[PDB]
């Protein structure tokens, strides 16, 4: 009833994301993997785990890539969700533009989730590609940014033990400074000022901590696989009508905020985004910080939009 | 409550093992990670997932491996379950007997699980390692053999669709040909003779199939991580008195069978192996397969204990 | 999107069944409750639980009963599953008449629905429902089941009590549903079965547990908390198979075409998007179980004829 | 591991409360059912359900009740949580609550008491007086179940803000019909309006009479408090084993804080019971008038029940 495709499934992120998706997909679904190198090896590895009721499809790659690769054209028949996770800005921009053109040509009513690293710039890029073809729904393009909310939630639960909250709202952007946590809109007696400042700074520059631990080897591969798999399950469950979750995602604001591509709460549904909620009441400190984030996001959209 | 340690966690197989454990461990547990290189990087990677109730520790290795190191001893204090997944025959046998020596000197009352490649050979080596120390409980040494059950369940499920079974018994050994799937002891009308031979053969050489598709660049890693993590849930959940599961494993056989280290069903409890069950009824074809399998397993055991 | 209706929700078992169903139904499901008296209370009592995504409807019955109740006809539009648990030396007659009328009223507007029978004289009431559906003109032999999970629950509990740390998830039970017809197949389960002369006592206990419970109640009532646990599980299995989210294997008092000579035995089946899709053979049994089976079948044969003669 | 005793298990609320507790209790625990009439019928009814790892005990009552029932003295040995459910009004119900706490606390002075008897405003302080005569009284181990309001509040708001859904709604005050004050300003998302929040906040305060009206004066919400009572008990047992630290709203005793000694306020459960008492938090002007009035009514109920003990 649902078909989920992963683009770039033989990488570090794609391998772990694929394993978690297999263990949680509903009965009777189907998977689909694609990569230039390593797809056959990964495909005949998940076919041995029992997981009754799940079928795995497979499409091999090609010697150094050519535009509009023929193999991907037959893999994209009848696909409902595309998880575009491929890359290692200039090099990554071309890869995103190449893939969306091939995938959207066969299936034009599907949903897209962007997981490539500079989400601020590749999300608007994908909007231009769908405009040239002539098919574009603003309610079916989402940029995954749930990783920051996972870091904000963890950092507050370890400071107010044994008081535990499920989630924390985060708005703004998703790169380095455009992330702003709204710690005031959660139940409980917030710890103190001049300590929320240290916690708020940690969430923004938490990425550089992981790459420093690896001594410049890699990045936080395991974190985004968990964050990507959680968000992907939200879309499919809402697609079948088994949920109406309220999540935070980098979406296109139809009016609303002056910035056209802010990261604001939404309500998912059968047809995609269903409701766009206002940010809500915020304090003075979170007001000055938010106004600085919107300015930086403005340039990021334009720079990404210069390419395409 | 319960402390779980994964030795050799920065490898390709052990990285997916740790991620799966963090999402299933009970509230208030602990996770310990150790490897020679790359331990801190994995450590400050899972610490960012929220997962309230779980703490994470780690210990870093050093220059090319030396004998028993202080870093491994400090992490091993008060550890209930040890998962040994580390390696690259003689190269792996030397590594395994070193970690068990250093781990068992600080927590002799723990449960040891073996994940490394020569299962029929590394498991008796660890038992001979513990005897030399002075402490060895035959109910607290298990060799993981759940991958064969996962393969045999999938292959038989594809053939009898839409009939689904939760598990399939597998006895014998682990290497290539000692694996004997007992398809007669499952509920249902088995498809047909002269077809089960191919299915039983596919399970025997399923490992070689993955390496060929990888162009001889590696082996299965995503499938072995799932089996290793699933088995550790049974041991931990039973230790804290929340279940008593019946599993198949490559365990010691005191009395019972003639082979000193056959793989047979057991029942797990608050002290480890508490009840060993007989293999049960079999047919003629499976009896012949088990007769040849026993001969190779006996020879495999002797070679490992010699080392 | 699935519609599940519980007929007789204000009785002793209907209330617990409805409460158990409310917490397990899938998102977007709808629950209907009908009874002659007491339906509004159950309705605007269950509606105050959170249960996001589930709507609760109801239709109150009437005065001393009348045939073809107009409220039931209106409530039966757009229904997928019918869960029929409604009833009070002549206990059989009242229940048979009630079931006949209820099936006649419910199937006249939704012929493509599943019927589940939970009224106690199962062996005689299931062929009554089949014959009524035949009389109407619509009858699907893969969409008519009789719940028989209570005996399996009892057998599993007893055999797990016998063997201390060795647990099994289920136990095959074939035959019928009365006290002489239940026959557990203890040979087709893993492990070293305890001993002879200890299994006969267990089988007798499985057969007489109902009278044990009734007598323990000082002759005042019957088993209601246990009977409501089985119906909820069977209904969950049916709805999840119908929606396409599973294909499980169950034991139920279903029809058989061909196979056994007895028209309405209880054998393992596999459920699918169209109800039953594959009936399986009973399997290999030992000699002691064989002797029970031929005696079990004889009583079931005479049970079926009474129900058919009633119509 | 954990022994849970349900007092009054053969009643309308107790029977359904026991059925839900059998399906959700952790492996390795034990149930204990007691009542004056009908205990044997219920006890040998839940033992047929397999649920491997659970043992069901039983203890019959007596003739028309006598003080200090001997049968209730052996069952009280080893219990870890007591769920007082027996009931029929204030004069009759106060005698029953006073008798059972006296017998149970004399054998198991280190257990948790979860009062579910109907006059929660008046019966909770009564049990405090009973425990003081014996000489053992822990204020962190005595709680009153008032979770049926949060269930009613969440369902009513979620039916008007579709498709926006919240998991819980904070409710404080008391528990009868005027002492309930829901705090609808403390939830995420844009609140609907005014002059409609007034009708919603009022319905939560008069919902009990609506259930009785539908029954034509035959009963009350038996199924609702069974679900509410069973869900609340699971929080306490899990926090005793150390498997959770939930934050819940309950009618507890405050060691200072509010001037009213028995307000309903948020708390944090732990290994020893209540581990933290949290401030109510910011509220709006409209809800400020309701809360100030509610405290005045609550004060009478505490003193009305605390003088019956003498």
Numbering used by the authors:
A (entry chain B): 1 to 88, 100 to 319
B (entry chain C): 1 to 88, 100 to 318
C (entry chain A): 1 to 88, 97 to 319
D (entry chain D): 1 to 88, 99 to 320
Passage from the reporting paper:
Having no protein synthetic abilities, peroxisomes import all required enzymes from the cytosol through a peroxin (Pex) import system. Peroxisome targeting sequence 1 (PTS1)-tagged cargo is recognized by cytosolic receptor, Pex5. The cargo-Pex5 complex docks at the peroxisomal membrane translocon, composed of Pex14 and Pex13, facilitating translocation into the peroxisomal lumen. MDH is a crucial enzyme for the glycolysis auxiliary pathway, maintaining the pool of malate/oxaloacetate.
The tetramer is composed of two dimers related by dihedral (D2) symmetry. The peroxisomal targeting signal 1 (PTS1) motifs of all MDH subunits are found at the periphery of the tetramer and are equally accessible to the solvent. The additional density is observed only at sites occupied by Pex5, and not at the vacant PTS1 sites, indicating that it corresponds to a fragment of the Pex5457-489 loop.
